[PDB]
Design a protein around this ligand. Structure first.
Ligand code: ZN
Lengths: 168, 56, 226, 141, 56, 171
């Protein structure tokens, strides 16, 4: 419709995507907000669905250990699909190498903090995806971190986020 | 300004602006060929709500 | 008259002198040295032909410089609308600046790759997927032929130097435009140029008089103001 | 670009392949294997059943006139406008020479082949410094 | 582009409009006919898409 | 990046597979054509969420062919590329005009004019590496790269990257 130009540069400074709006609608008729997921929690949540579909397949023929997981889901994925998803093995390797916390309960306690703080969702999802510890060099690296958030409050949440995460 | 009285002719258009602006009645129209440039520019200077009224 | 108007006259003079052919220079210098001209008087004064007069008048139409006048005493007259000339020059210099800046910005980036068989342009990011199986040559989709890089990455400094030298040449014009912006923009008419009539000859058959008819109720394009 | 389609059976490859055309169904088959190559042939006779460009050259000749659902007031304008582009081409002089050699050959009752060969002989040179005018009729003679 | 004597240019641009109109359709109000050689008229698009097996 | 969204996808099925156990067959189907897929709209599609209580509920037989289609609404994990984000990806292959960093699904490449000139490039390296203090392409090859734009096209997706920023590149 009139070529629908809508020229937006994508940036971390609330310069959003053209399809990835904050507000959508869902199939039930209720309002579907935007969902963003960090690197640590994404790596944690994918294994739930992985073991769920593996035991689901095991029931079909009936009717955190990442060193295990990198070969294990390779075997599961080559069992059902082909061996073309070396790209997916690389994506999950990225998900498991550089996520900020290896375990699950530290990320869960971080989420239990964030549900009470009520921070900006895309901002804190970017913070969870990135792996840093001090807020001023995080600011000098990312101008969104420079301008959106005060450094003192960023540091006072960064230390109680960074104490939980396993250091590398 | 006025609109000129427009007579369809052949494969073009002409207009005779009567326009009657002297001290007398001044019935003196000039028959000038309606140049497709000036029709294009005056079409380019129309409002979108005028297009909706005019069925465009 | 206005010394800024004299600066404008010398500005138009220098624009044609440094950026147009000598026939254009002679035509504009004649019509500034004198005033509004019949074509016959100009053809006498320069001893030229209408075949030579044609493309000069046409290009001066094309740059929106000469304001023609047509009236019967039919007699052809020529002048220059000052704000039309100023705004045409302003759009010309702004288009030169933006076009040369974007051309310099594109040319500062490296070349791409050239296929001598099909003789077509290609870019580096288009050639990213044009690598072969062994990363040796850049494979062609049609010709199956290696792709070789252009010579334009060293034309970055050439476009930069052309922009800088042209900017230095137009810097008197930029300063004159600044002084015009300091001053007041004024609109020419045929009768205004008639008030500065500088007599070329003594036997001009075309009388240099603006004589509209009674009941001249027409508003004409290029001849009125909002 | 090399502008080239070559047809080859993908299962025999003995040569540029010994293939045949079945025009009654418009298909092509490698005669050894018996597999199709392509389908829906375009006819090569029906266009000649449907309806001098080499002598008139690449530019194409056009005579214009009147019809039934037209007006005499503008077909006379057309009759005086048909010569407004004859000076753009030298083909007005080419067709004047063609008309005059038609005058000559049919005056001497010469056939169509003699007429077209004289047209060819003019169209061959038609312009040299050796030609140089020479009364314009010596070249046609 | 070259020296226009302001008589041929108007009838020339009228010819341009005439030929694009004739190519567009040749069933116009019959002031021209505008055929091309030979004596059969040039078949324009309303002739291509008219009734009686005109493409529809 | 790694995101969750509701997605509805339509799939079809051959009429010879009209046996009693086709719901699980459709499920298996949904796994191989969801897995290993990169789209332009949502980047690469990783895997599926909420395997149980999936909604298919109805299908239509095509009128001209016995094949029947089925729309599937589901939750999934997908990767969405973006512009201007520092990531610590890994490098597998390198070229003389620039290294090819494999950050997850992409192969983000930095062209010869986007490496900083104060980086001490050596041509005599196998693979050719751009190292100054510690940013060496290794078996780990963790290099801080910023994708300032991922150029999605006809579906051979490539991202552009740069290390022309302080602490970017070096680790
Ligand atoms: Zn064969």
């Amino acid at each position: 419709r009139l070529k629908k130009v809508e020229e937006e540069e994508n940036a971390a400074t609330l310069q959003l995507g053209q399809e990835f709006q904050l507000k959508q609608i869902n199939h039930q008729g209720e309002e579907e907000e935007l969902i963003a997921l960090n690197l640590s929690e994404a790596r944690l949540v994918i294994k739930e669905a992985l073991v769920e579909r593996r035991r689901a397949f095991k029931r079909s023929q009936k009717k955190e250990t990442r060193e295990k997981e990198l070969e294990s889901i390779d075997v599961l994925l080559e069992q059902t699909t082909g061996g073309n998803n070396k790209d997916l093995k690389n994506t999950m390797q990225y998900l498991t190498n550089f996520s900020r916390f290896r375990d699950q309960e530290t990320v869960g306690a971080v989420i239990q903090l964030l549900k009470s703080t009520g921070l900006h969702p895309f901002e804190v999802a970017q913070l969870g995806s990135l792996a840093c510890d001090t807020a001023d060099e995080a600011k000098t690296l990312i101008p969104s971190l420079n301008n959106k958030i005060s450094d003192d409050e960023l540091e006072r949440i960064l230390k109680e986020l960074s104490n939980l995460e396993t250091l590398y | 300004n006025t609109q000129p009285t427009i007579r369809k002719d052949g494969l073009k258009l002409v207009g005779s602006w009567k326009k009657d602006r002297a001290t007398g009645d001044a019935d003196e129209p000039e028959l000038r060929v309606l140049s497709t440039e000036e029709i294009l520019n005056i079409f380019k200077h129309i409002s979108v709500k005028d297009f909706t009224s005019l069925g465009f | 008259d206005r010394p800024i108007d004299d600066i404008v006259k010398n500005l138009l003079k220098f624009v044609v002198r440094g950026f147009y052919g000598g026939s254009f220079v002679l035509v504009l210098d004649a019509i500034l040295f004198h005033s509004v001209l019949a074509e016959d008087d100009l053809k006498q004064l320069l001893s030229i032909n209408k075949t030579e007069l044609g493309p000069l008048i046409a290009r001066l139409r094309s740059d929106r410089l000469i304001s023609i006048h047509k009236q019967r005493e039919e007699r052809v007259y020529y002048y220059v609308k000052y704000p039309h000339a100023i705004d045409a020059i302003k759009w010309k210099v702004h288009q030169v600046v933006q076009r040369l800046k974007d051309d310099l910005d594109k040319n500062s980036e490296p070349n791409g790759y050239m296929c001598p068989i099909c003789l077509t342009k290609y870019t580096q990011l288009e050639a990213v997927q044009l690598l072969n199986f062994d990363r040796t040559e850049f494979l062609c989709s049609l010709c199956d032929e290696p792709l070789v890089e252009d010579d334009s990455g060293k034309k970055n400094k050439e476009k930069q130097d052309k922009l800088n030298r042209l900017m230095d040449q137009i810097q008197p014009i930029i300063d004159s435009l600044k002084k015009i912006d300091d001053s007041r923009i004024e609109e020419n008419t045929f009768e205004i140029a008639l008030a500065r009539l500088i007599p070329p000859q003594n036997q001009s058959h075309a009388a240099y008089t603006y004589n509209p008819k009674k009941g001249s109720t027409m508003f004409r394009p290029g001849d009125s103001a909002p | 670009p090399n502008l080239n389609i070559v047809l080859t059976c993908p299962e025999c490859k003995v040569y540029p392949p010994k293939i045949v055309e079945r025009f009654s169904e418009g298909d092509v088959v490698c005669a050894l294997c018996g597999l199709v190559l392509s389908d829906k042939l375009v006819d090569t006779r029906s266009e000649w059943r449907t309806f001098n460009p080499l002598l008139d050259g690449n530019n194409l000749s056009t005579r214009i006139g009147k019809g039934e659902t037209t007006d005499m007031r503008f077909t006379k304008e057309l009759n005086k406008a048909q010569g407004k582009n004859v000076m753009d081409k030298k083909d007005n002089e080419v067709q004047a020479a063609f008309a005059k050699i038609t005058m000559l050959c049919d005056a001497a009752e010469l056939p169509k082949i003699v007429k077209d060969c004289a047209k060819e002989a003019y169209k061959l040179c038609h312009d040299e410094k050796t030609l140089k005018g020479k009364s314009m009729e010596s070249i046609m003679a | 582009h070259n020296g226009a004597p302001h008589h041929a240019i108007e009838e020339a641009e009228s010819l341009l409009q005439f030929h694009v109109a004739t190519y567009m359709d040749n069933d116009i109000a019959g002031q021209p006919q505008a055929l091309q050689k030979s004596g059969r008229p040039v078949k324009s698009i309303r002739a291509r898409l008219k009734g009686k097996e005109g493409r529809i | 990046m790694f995101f969750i969204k509701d997605l509805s996808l339509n799939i079809t099925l051959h009429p010879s597979f009209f046996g009693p156990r086709m719901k699980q067959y459709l499920k298996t189907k949904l796994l191989e054509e969801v897995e290993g897929s990169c789209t332009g709209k949502f980047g690469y599609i990783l895997c599926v969420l909420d395997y149980d209580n999936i909604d298919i509920q109805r299908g239509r037989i095509l009128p001209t062919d016995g094949s029947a289609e089925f729309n599937v609404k589901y939750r999934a994990v997908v990767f969405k590329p973006f512009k201007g984000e520092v990531v610590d990806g890994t490098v597998v292959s390198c070229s003389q005009h620039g290294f090819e960093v494999q950050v997850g699904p992409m192969k983000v490449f930095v062209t010869k004019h986007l490496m900083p000139q104060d980086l001490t490039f050596n041509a005599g390296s196998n693979p050719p590496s751009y190292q100054s203090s510690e940013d060496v392409i290794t078996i780990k090859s963790r290099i801080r790269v910023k994708i300032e734009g991922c150029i999605s096209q006809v579906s051979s997706i490539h991202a552009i990257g740069s290390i022309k920023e302080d602490y970017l590149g070096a680790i």
